[PDB]
Design a protein around this motif. Sequence first.
Motif: not given
Ligand code: CL
Length: 362
Positions: A127-129, A211-213, A237-239, A246-248
């Motif tokens: 889904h993501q690398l 979390w990953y960068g 880059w993330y917001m 969400r993820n955490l």
């Molecule tokens: Cl994500």
Amino acid sequence: EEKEILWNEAKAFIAACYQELGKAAEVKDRLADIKSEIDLTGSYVHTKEELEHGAKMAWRNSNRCIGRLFWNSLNVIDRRDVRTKEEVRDALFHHIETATNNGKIRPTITIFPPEEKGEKQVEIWNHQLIRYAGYESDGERIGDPASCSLTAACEELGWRGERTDFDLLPLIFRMKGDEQPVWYELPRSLVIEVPITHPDIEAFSDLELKWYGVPIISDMKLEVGGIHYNAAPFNGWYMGTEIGARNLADEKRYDKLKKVASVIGIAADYNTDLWKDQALVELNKAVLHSYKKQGVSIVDHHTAASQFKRFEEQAEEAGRKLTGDWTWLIPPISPAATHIFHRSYDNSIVKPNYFYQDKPYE
Ligand SMILES: [Cl-]
Ligand code: HEM
Ligand SMILES: Cc1cc(N)nc(COC[C@H](N)[C@H](C)OCc2cc(C)cc(N)n2)c1
């Protein structure tokens, strides 16, 4: 018929692309070349210029993306030349490294050869690398539940995860003509991770969160002028909210709010205490603090909304229609503190764009 839909998409995309690139005069002859190519081969090949502008237009048209102000500085890596699984693996490794840029993240897309007869040349399963594995063994939940089915599929293929909460999934993809995908373990030296700490509350590190960068979306299809790039991973880059809200935080993901509440020293007993709200804010503060402390690019939702306002103003100045999906544009914490919340957006789908496609597992 499928030829005709290709031809119509092509005409529309070349006219719009060349107009934006100040090359309107070249349209007629290029269309003529494309028509003959489709006539003969059943397809056509983008120039480097068309491919690059096509990927940028696609980002610009991504209704759900708050980050579109920076659409024109997308770094487009053209890997239509790859033919072997080693070349694919090395392209994905290189994408990670070049996109990560030692923490100063560069928005990048790597474009692999497109579908032909709707036949995929390269099919990416991730889904993501960079993503964490997920497990459930009779009641026992470990890692990221969103990765459960992909993880089970990798473990069919001879991979075995350590059953930590943060196992990195291997790269997994299939080449045309192979029945089974291949997998490769990610080199750890390529993957930046961020430990989550809080600026004021020392005990926050007791949660051992990280979390990953870099979020590198690897399962969507890039459609440009009728051509289907099913394998074209891209990153920004993330917001901060994406990680912290969400993820955490999500109950179907890492589900950490009660643990957060405990370490920041508030009770988690009464809805009227707004303990989940307070926990969300501190966790989101932690995420932003941690990325910044470690030198990894990230944006907060207020700055991102401000940037998006500039994107809206820019579309209007250029005389381009704006499209958006309000339901994804509003941040999931303090949405009404943003201008986005207080207006509406046309959710029409305009191409080029990025689209969902069916997953080969599940
Ligand atoms: Cl994500
Ligand atoms: C540069 C920094 C970037 C930031 C901060 C950013 C931010 C976002 C955010 C906050 C969302 C909403 C996600 C959610 O609510 O869960 C989003 C969705 C999206 N973004 Fe961006 N983005 C960036 C770069 C890009 C790039 C480079 C592309 C493509 C070239 C892109 C394409 C999309 C797409 C296709 C979606 C929707 C995905 C889906 O429907 O599942 N983003 N992005
Ligand atoms: C149903 C649903 C709604 C909603 N708002 N979000 C989701 C899941 O979103 C998960 C991720 N945040 C999405 C896929 O990431 C988008 C994205 C892409 C890119 C290139 C960069 C970035 N920062 N974020 C699911």
